[PDB]
Scaffold this active site. Structure first.
Site, mmCIF file in Angstrom:
data_model
loop_
_atom_site.group_PDB
_atom_site.id
_atom_site.type_symbol
_atom_site.label_atom_id
_atom_site.label_comp_id
_atom_site.label_asym_id
_atom_site.label_seq_id
_atom_site.Cartn_x
_atom_site.Cartn_y
_atom_site.Cartn_z
ATOM 1 N N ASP A 107 42.939 36.314 43.948
ATOM 2 C CA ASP A 107 42.205 35.340 43.125
ATOM 3 C C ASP A 107 42.596 35.450 41.656
ATOM 4 O O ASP A 107 42.908 34.455 41.011
ATOM 5 C CB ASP A 107 40.684 35.426 43.313
ATOM 6 C CG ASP A 107 40.132 36.824 43.105
ATOM 7 O OD1 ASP A 107 40.935 37.754 42.795
ATOM 8 O OD2 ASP A 107 38.882 37.001 43.266
ATOM 9 N N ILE A 108 42.596 36.655 41.128
ATOM 10 C CA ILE A 108 42.735 36.781 39.694
ATOM 11 C C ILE A 108 43.556 37.988 39.248
ATOM 12 O O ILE A 108 43.397 39.065 39.751
ATOM 13 C CB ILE A 108 41.343 36.735 38.987
ATOM 14 C CG1 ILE A 108 41.516 36.835 37.486
ATOM 15 C CG2 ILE A 108 40.419 37.840 39.441
ATOM 16 C CD1 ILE A 108 40.279 36.422 36.704
ATOM 17 N N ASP A 110 43.615 40.356 36.465
ATOM 18 C CA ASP A 110 42.732 40.890 35.419
ATOM 19 C C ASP A 110 43.081 42.379 35.241
ATOM 20 O O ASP A 110 42.466 43.233 35.872
ATOM 21 C CB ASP A 110 41.252 40.710 35.831
ATOM 22 C CG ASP A 110 40.248 41.173 34.734
ATOM 23 O OD1 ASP A 110 40.680 41.622 33.646
ATOM 24 O OD2 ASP A 110 39.012 41.057 34.954
ATOM 25 N N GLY A 112 45.219 44.106 36.733
ATOM 26 C CA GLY A 112 46.088 44.202 37.885
ATOM 27 C C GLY A 112 46.568 45.615 38.235
ATOM 28 O O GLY A 112 47.600 45.752 38.873
ATOM 29 N N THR A 114 45.034 47.607 40.371
ATOM 30 C CA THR A 114 44.898 47.673 41.813
ATOM 31 C C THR A 114 45.883 46.764 42.539
ATOM 32 O O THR A 114 46.478 47.130 43.556
ATOM 33 C CB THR A 114 43.427 47.619 42.286
ATOM 34 O OG1 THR A 114 43.354 46.972 43.550
ATOM 35 C CG2 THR A 114 42.600 46.937 41.368
ATOM 36 N N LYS A 138 44.285 36.159 33.620
ATOM 37 C CA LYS A 138 43.792 36.432 32.269
ATOM 38 C C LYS A 138 44.981 36.825 31.391
ATOM 39 O O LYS A 138 45.262 38.003 31.188
ATOM 40 C CB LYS A 138 42.713 37.516 32.273
ATOM 41 C CG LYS A 138 41.336 36.908 32.487
ATOM 42 C CD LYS A 138 40.382 37.870 33.157
ATOM 43 C CE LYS A 138 38.936 37.422 32.976
ATOM 44 N NZ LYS A 138 37.968 38.381 33.567
ATOM 45 N N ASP A 168 33.907 36.280 42.955
ATOM 46 C CA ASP A 168 32.479 36.538 43.169
ATOM 47 C C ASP A 168 31.757 36.968 41.908
ATOM 48 O O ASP A 168 32.349 37.443 40.968
ATOM 49 C CB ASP A 168 32.254 37.630 44.229
ATOM 50 C CG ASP A 168 32.707 39.006 43.743
ATOM 51 O OD1 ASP A 168 33.851 39.063 43.256
ATOM 52 O OD2 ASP A 168 31.930 39.991 43.827
#
Lengths: 189, 190
Positions: A107-108, A110, A112, A114, A138, A168
């Site tokens: 999804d994103i 941010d 990164g 992980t 981002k 979420d």
């Protein structure tokens, strides 16, 4: 006592819309075009990064007009784990990825950290090539050990507290139809 | 260098017959969403994806559901010989957090549904208060012992064709096909 769904309704009600669902779909169309140019002849395994990758991936998939297989992966990290070396695996990359071109979808972007660990673990299973795709990046925020660039990006956003279209707010609101920003009242600072 | 699997995949897709267009599929998802809303909007459900077939239908359905919900996923496999569902192999099990929750289980197709019924029963055994089932396509004339007898929500009813697309695979390929397609009898004889 006060209910979690009632609080969720209030968060969503007070949120501000950054992008409409239409704009998100339009960003998926652009991604698809780019992904096609790069991958159409590569017989990729497309890997969903759970759980956030699920909405974006499912919506992207029927736009991709070339042969491909789908799989999924699940890893979590403690915020304090700055290296990505203490990652908690729930679903590991498979041995079948050996020799394959792989596209990892989340999804994103941010930080990164992980996402970078997941990618490196896929490389460690013998994948030939690993690409990354992300619904939102981002773009101003980069961190050491993080993924520096995604190959495919739908939308570039500033560092807001955001949810929707797979992202979420405490497990809720992945079903919100667009990209939203949490109201300052509910932003725990 | 001999013919590859992807080359054969292209030929299957080329010769396939379109049963439902992508527009008709999206319209079916809209109808499911309305039904799911009327039944579940007040229930705070956990929506569970049955991997991997559930992923495209769920992802498309999710942003149509206008009420509070959480998402999770499950994965189980079965031998064709296991007609009972007593010997299913779990890869990802239902969590204990499902205890006392309303759960909606989402898969691509009801085709016998033996595995799907076992998954549902296992979710009940973890203490879920209610389990509902949703399926993009139902092979409505095919029912088998130990199989799911009826889904609560069905997008499209179809005959027992060899079909693929919109999350349904043909040997792990073609889940990305934009619609519902029937494999040509030259590729799949009955």
């Amino acid at each position: 006592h006060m209910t979690i769904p009632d609080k969720i309704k209030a968060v969503y009600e007070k949120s501000t819309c950054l992008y409409t669902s239409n704009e998100v779909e339009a960003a998926l169309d652009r991604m698809a075009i780019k992904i096609h140019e790069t991958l159409q002849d590569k017989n990729p395994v497309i890997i969903c990064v759970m759980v956030g990758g699920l909405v974006p991936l499912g919506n992207l998939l029927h736009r991709l007009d070339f042969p491909l297989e789908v799989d999924y992966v699940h890893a979590t990290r403690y915020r304090g784990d700055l290296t990505g070396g203490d990652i908690l695996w729930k679903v590991r990359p498979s041995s079948n990825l050996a020799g394959r071109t792989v596209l990892v979808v989340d999804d994103i972007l941010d930080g990164g950290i992980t996402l970078a660990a997941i990618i490196n673990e896929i490389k460690a299973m013998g994948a030939a090539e690993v690409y990354s795709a992300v619904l939102v990046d981002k773009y101003r925020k980069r961190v050491p050990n993080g993924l520096q660039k995604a190959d495919f990006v739908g939308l570039q956003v500033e560092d807001h507290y955001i949810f929707g279209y797979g992202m979420d707010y405490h497990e809720y609101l992945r079903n919100a139809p667009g990209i939203f920003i949490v109201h300052p009242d509910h932003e725990a600072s």
